[PDB]
Amino acid sequence: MAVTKVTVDGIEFPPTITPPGSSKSLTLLGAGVRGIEIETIQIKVTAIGVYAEPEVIASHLQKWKGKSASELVEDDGFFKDLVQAPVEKLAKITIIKGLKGSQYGGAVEENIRDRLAALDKYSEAEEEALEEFREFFKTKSLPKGSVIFFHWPSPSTLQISFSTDGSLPEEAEATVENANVAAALLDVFLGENSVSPSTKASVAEGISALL
Ligand SMILES: [Cl-]
């Protein structure tokens, strides 16, 4: 029997997902990969899938209707609107090349702090939030195939989950309630100096299609 699958270089991403502890079901908008470059050698380390409520986020982005995928990815304002949009969002991250949690966490945290410090939005509250974020990854190992779940039930709140085998948890492990960190983390992936332009392209064409 036939099945429809979404894949990024063979890594399978479900077309819809229900975040840990959530009732809602989110729809995949697009997916790409985060690739680290050494010399002229490119290493893919993670696959990233971006999910949200399709009708709702389509409604909030209606000013971009009929705008082409080519035109959206060219425009930082669209991605600002996508990041700001007050809808549930989820990032599913599948580890390609294994690594230790404190490494991934450390790098992402530094990226966030850089963004927030640049914006003059880094105080003790953010440091504590990032303490939580840091502590979450400190204790864990991220082997190939393990998956991280970043859940934004609203733009101000971040919920983190993780499964070593790639299955879907039914409740979140960590909650970071800090608007700046939550938004910055989303900005790591969909923002101006994205760790994954491919993911942004994929989301752009998905959203363009969705409108
Ligand atoms: Cl990543």
Write up this protein.
By secondary structure, this protein is α+β, with helices and mostly antiparallel strands. The chain has two domains: 1-55 and 85-189, 3-Layer(bba) Sandwich (Chalcone isomerase); 56-84 and 190-211, 10k-s Protein, Hypothetical Protein A, Chain A. It is 38% helix and 29% strand. The strands form three sheets. It has a seven-stranded antiparallel beta sheet. Helix 4 (101-118) packs antiparallel against helix 5 (124-138) and helix 4 (101-118) crosses helix 6 (179-190). The chain is globular, with a radius of gyration of 16 Å. The structure holds chloride ion.
In short:
By secondary structure, this protein is an alpha+beta fold. It is built from seven helices and eleven strands. β4 and β5 form a beta hairpin.
Number of strands: 11
What overall form do the CA principal axes indicate?
globular
Structural class: alpha+beta
Task: List the bound ligands.
Answer: chloride ion
CATH T-level topology of the largest domain? Chalcone isomerase
Helix content, binned percent: 25-40%
- CATH second-level architecture of the largest domain: 3-Layer(bba) Sandwich
First-last Cα distance = 31 Å
The number of helices is: 7
The main β sheet shows up as: 7 strands, antiparallel
Please indicate the count of domains: 2
**Biggest sheet, strands in spatial order?**
3-4-5-6-9-10-11
Radius of gyration: 16 Å
User: How much beta, percentage-wise?
Assistant: 25-35%
What are the secondary-structure elements, in order, as H or E? EEEEEHHHEEHHEEEEHH
CATH class wording of the largest domain: Alpha Beta
